[PDB]
Amino acid sequence: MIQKVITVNGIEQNLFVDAEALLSDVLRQQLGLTGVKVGCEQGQCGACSVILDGKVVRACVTKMKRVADGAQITTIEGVGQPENLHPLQKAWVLHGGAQCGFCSPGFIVSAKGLLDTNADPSREDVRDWFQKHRNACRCTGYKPLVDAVMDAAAVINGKKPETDLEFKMPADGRIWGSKYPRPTAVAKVTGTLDYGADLGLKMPAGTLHLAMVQAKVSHANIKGIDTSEALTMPGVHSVITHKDVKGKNRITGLITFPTNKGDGWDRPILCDEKVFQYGDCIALVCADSEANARAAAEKVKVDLEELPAYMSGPAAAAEDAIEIHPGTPNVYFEQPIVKGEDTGPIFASADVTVEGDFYVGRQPHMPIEPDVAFAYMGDDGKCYIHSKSIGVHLHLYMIAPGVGLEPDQLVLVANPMGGTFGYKFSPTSEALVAVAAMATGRPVHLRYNYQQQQQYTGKRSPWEMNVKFAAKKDGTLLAMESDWLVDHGPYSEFGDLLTLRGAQFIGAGYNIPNIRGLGRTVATNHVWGSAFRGYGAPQSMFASECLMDMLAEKLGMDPLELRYKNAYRPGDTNPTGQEPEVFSLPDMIDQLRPKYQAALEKAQKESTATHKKGVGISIGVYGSGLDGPDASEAWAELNADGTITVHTAWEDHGQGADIGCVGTAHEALRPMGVAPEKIKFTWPNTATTPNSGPSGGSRQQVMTGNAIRVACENLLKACEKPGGGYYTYDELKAADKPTKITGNWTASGATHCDAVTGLGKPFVVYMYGVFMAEVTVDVATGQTTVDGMTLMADLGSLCNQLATDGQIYGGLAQGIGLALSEDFEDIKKHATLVGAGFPFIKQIPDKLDIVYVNHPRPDGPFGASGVGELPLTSPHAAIINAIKSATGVRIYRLPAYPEKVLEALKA
Template identity: 70%
Template sequence: MIKLNLTVNGVPRTLVVDPEESLADVLRKQLLLTGVKVGCGQGQCGACSVILDGKLVRSCVTKMKRVADGAGVTTVEGIGTPDNLHPIQEAWMAHGGAQCGFCTPGFIVSAKALLDENSRPSREDVRDWFQKHRNACRCTGYKQLTDAVMDAAKILRGEMRAADVRYKLPADGRVWGTNLPRPSAVAKVTGTWDFGADLGLKMPEGTLHLALVQATVSHANIKGIDTSEAEKMPGVYKVVTHKNVKGKNRITGLITFPTNKGDGWDRPILCDEKVFQYGDAIAIVCAETEKQAKAAAEKVKVDLEQLPEYMSAPAAMAEDAIEIHPGTPNVYYIQKIAKGPETKPLFDKAPVVVEGDFYTSRQPHLPIEPDVGCAYMNEQGQLVIHSKSIGLHLHLYMIAPGIGLEADKIVMVQNPTGGTFGYKFSPTMEALLGVAAMATGRPVYLNYTYHQQQTYTGKRSPQFTTVRFAAEKDGKLLAMETDWTVDHGPYSEFGDLLTLRGAQFIGAGYDIPSIRGEGRTVCTNHAWGAAFRGYGGPESEFGSELLMDELAEKLGMDPLELRYKNVYRKGSTTPTGQDPEVYSLPEMIDILRPKYQEALKRAKANSTAEVKRGVGVCVGVYGAGLDGPDSSEVFVELNEDNGVTVYSCWEDHGQGADAGSLGTAHEALRPLGLSPDKIRLVMNDTSKAPNSGPAGGSRSQVMTGNAIKAGCELLLASMRKADKSYRTHAEMVAEKIPTKISGKWTAPATNCDENGQGKPFCCYMYGLFMSEVAVELATGKTTMEKITMVADIGKVNNRLVVDGQMYGGLAQGIGLALTEDYEDIKKHSTLAGAGFPYIKQIPDNMEVIYVESERPDGPFGASGAGEIPLTCPHASVINAIYNACGVRITKLPALPEKVLAGLKTK
């Protein structure tokens, strides 16, 4: 141990520390300065950034033995407070820089260090700084962060006032469609928003820390588990194995379709008979400290009989492959599509036919905050589980039988959450916490390392897709044939629904009168397939959008004009046979056309012998909902002060559920003339709010938004007097009129039949993407220079929040196109190794244009938002690479070596 005297945020502190401890852990655990976040723990994300003696450092990799006695440390807590914001924090709020907010304190500290050093930075100076210091954001796309720093610099130079960037309520009091900062913004920019690990530090005495014993092979029979040595280790309270699980020790995958050959009970909470993938949990060590738990976990001995590892769908489909789940075939679900007349005669007679094979990769979600949670028994004898869950009621029912409790004995709470992008549709952490709390009878806490985040959370399911188009000589599509294979990893949850997406979205956006195809879900031993933004859209639309460019080339047509000829118009139907609810795609192309023509001229003029530039376009479509009659419920209550509280489980994984709830409720309650601060939100606790449904499939603004609208309208109706004025809370109570009302809404939609035909979504989202790239011929490296999106998501609730969703989704699409993958378990188990796109990999030049076609079934005309920006911007990037240098990449990601190989082949 060493004693240090430090000045932390201007306050002298005397500390006794372990010299090998990180500065981040000392600040967080000994001083409770939880504005210092630990994401990757490897110096790759910058969430832990602090200023040490005037220099920006990543505190998670700064050992205390390197911190000088008398050093000065500044954290986000020393930059500004909720009642005294720094200009950087003011600007961050104004530009929507804090989405999930986990990386925000690190960025703000980094920006402070930059502006201390350079008071007049250019945009490139800002981007270079964040790149150099490895400040990583997964939510925003970075543009808003640069905007915020530029405005903060102006305020600090005296060229503008902080008041100039603050939100101002419009004169009419309406917040719908404005840039109102989300309610959580102040807490996020000041580091006072407590994420899971922050709450973990504030758990009561007696809380046990958990460490997992995990498989280091991908497929094996378990012959024995010896915990005896681990149980003797210091601080160990209990080692939990499958024998200690009171329920059936399975997480149900909630099989969606009766033709699924599995039963949905294929995922063990703790492996008992077999290991199905690398990282599978075999035991949980429960100890007094995290270090003790991890040390003991190393002592658990697992006797394994290794089995063949099927790490891809083709391997698992081979004739000699054994069944990964004995009794269930590796190909366990088939989805067909049959729309219109038979395709074969049309292909036989068609003047033009094109076809291609395509592959979309196992994209990792790459949140900055690793998975984390805690659990305990409350005073009512209920098991309470806090986590990053984005499907609270859904997860309650998925884990209850497995852990051995009735559903009413479990309470699910979503902690403030640092991004999930869909991976938290899987309740693995929740089940592990529940089992440990029940087995020990004590509060428990578990926080994954980033290696665990990468190796034991779900990924986007890779998809092998074959598409064929038949067309007239003028480019009119006649027919499409498809075949797709979904590599869903070892666990079946939502695998059948994901495979249905191929029937719904291959060829989406175009009037194709005749379609035939078949898809399948395949069990493999690689990472399990989890929900990921776009959920089937990026996989399905990639192939058909690349093939549209190939068709255009074969016909000698412009790719944008070929799309214009075929997009939905009156009389068109979607691949499921459903009529589109709006027909905005022609208008969207008309808006993009002049920009596209200018981009083509720019690419030609700026290409050189060494660097070729190109432009690519594509169309994206996605549904807002979870298929068929999806529904949601909220409570709306009139308060004693005549404000209103909205209770919902509109889960927030960074997308802005608080802003969505507030904006929708405020619009519905406008007759009361309430200011936004008079609307309170009680969110994401199943003991307090009803089942609003999971936050996925861009369903929440439509489903829960409509439920909020319905609840508010019912409350207004009960408050309305004969003279059309409104009762106060006191008058409601005096007249014995209920002040708390349930709002419910169910989508007017129907499920698809066995051939993929039906009306699965009442609202869709439409996107048009244009990428401009530069390709270095000597290396094959692709650089994004600009990306443009024309988006129709219906009426926009909150422009600040929706802009952030668009920019962030586009950035993830660029990552999918160029760098991101989780194929090699060792190589891809870090942020950098998995191809995380830092700020210089994302263009500063991003443009989003909205076409607000009012949705008949959307609340105040809104549709969903989150999925559409990641439906297929990656296809526009790949099309742009081909336009630049003539190399067509059909298997993602388009790494430089792939492009270079294509150039050499040319």
């Protein structure tokens, strides 16, 4: 050990440290500076950025031996605090740069380092700086972060007054549609919002820290578990196995389709008879620290009989394949789509036909914050779980039978969380922590490292697809045929539903009267499927939007004009036979057209012999809702202090559940003149908030926004005074009148898609958009650079523009990754951010352009649709179409790795 006397955030610290200890651990654990966020732990994400003697360093890869006596360190806590915000923090809030907020401290500290060395950076200087310092963001697409740095710099430079970094209320007083900052922003930009790992550090002594004993093969029969060496190791309390589970030790898919061949009870909590994928949790070590638990987990010995593993859909679907779940065929679900007339004769007599085979793979979510959860037994006898769940009520029912609790004896709460992008539509760690809390009686905390986040959370499910179009010479679509095979890994939850998405979205955007297709879901031993932003659309629409360009090529037609010819207009129906609710695609195409033509001309002018430029188009469509007559509930309550609490379980991945609540409520409450800062939101809790439903399917703004609107309308009625005006809390309580008022809303016009035909009216609101990608391909290396993305978006009406702009930029960036760099195929190589192709700032163009072409929705609150998943529906198709425009080569199987593009260029 060594004494080091240094200054941290301007205050002398008399530190006692191991010279080999990591600065991140010292700052977070010894000094309580949990504003230093840790994600990857490998120097790749920048979340742990601190200033050390004028240099921005990653604290997770800086050992204390590198910190000199008398060193100066600054963390986010030294940049500024609530009510003493630095210009960078104020700018972040104003520009909406904190979505999940997990990267915000690190970007802000890094930016202070930049501005201390270059007071007047260009936007490119800012981008170069964040590239060099490895500041990674998965939510924002980087543009808002650069915007914030530039604004702060202007203020620090005296070019602009600091008051201009503070939001100015619009003249109309309306926050609906405005850039009003989100309530959680201040906490996020000051490092004072506690995420799950932060909470772990602040839990009491005697909290047990868990480590997973995980399968290191992909498929096996388990013969035994020996914990004897582990029990002797430092700090170890006990080891938990399936024998300690008090219920069924299975997670239920809950809404497993009747025509699924499996019962939906396939997924264990702790493996008992079998390993089904690499990473499966076989045991939990409980210890006094994460470090001691992990060390001991390495000594637990599992005796396995390894089995041949099926690592792709086609392998597992072979007629000869051995059943992974004995008694259930590996191909456990099929969904037909049968619209209109038989397609065979139409293809035979059509002027033109096209066909393609396409692939979209196992995209990894890559939030900056790896999975983390904790649980404890309450003083009331219930088991409490606090996690990254984005469907607390859903997950309660998925896990309660398995853990052996009745639903009223378990409570799930959503912690503040650093992104999910859908992986948390699935249970991950909740059942594990519940079992351990129940077995020990003690609080327990489980933090995944980044390798576990990659290997042992669910993934976008790969689809192998064949799609065909028949059309007239004038471009009018006549018929479509489709086939898709969904590799869902070993756990069935929502796999049938994901497969149904192919019937709904392959070919969406156009009038196609005649469709014959079939989706099939297959169990494999690769990573299990969890929702990933777009949930079936990125697969489906990659195929159909690439195939539209192939059709245009075969006709000698411009691909934007081919889309214009076929786009939904009154009278048309979507693939499930339902009429669209608004018709904005022609409007959006007409408004895009001159920008597309100019982009084509620029690409022609600026292309060189070696660097070929191209422009690509695609359409995106997706539902806002879960299928059928989805519903939500909210409670609007006048509090004694005159504030109003809007109680919901609107789960916040980081997308803006807080501001969606406040903005929607504000608009609904305008007759009573309620200031936005007087409106409070509630963190999701299954005991004390209503069943608003999960934040999946881009649904909350529509479903919960409507429930909030109704609850607020009902509160206004409850407060109305005879003769005009409104009663105060005191007046209502004195008259023994209610102050907490319910509202509910149901999408009553919706119906589930049929099991035989796929036809129905699954959503009452959809999101519609048109993408344009501008790219450059280096034909010597095959490397593609995306120079610009544009989204024409019809969101009906904006609840909050900081929220929607940010959602779109973030989705576009994930689309660039999906197109060019991302996959989870190689269990070890793709288990790091850099290994799996995470998009760092230079991969995302500064030119991300949005044009809102909003057609108010009949059933949306104040006309709103969702936004969340729209920007990932097909940006990757636009990008691949742009590579084709540039070079003549078509990549059918994502991602467009440089060598793959080169091979195609040279064939």
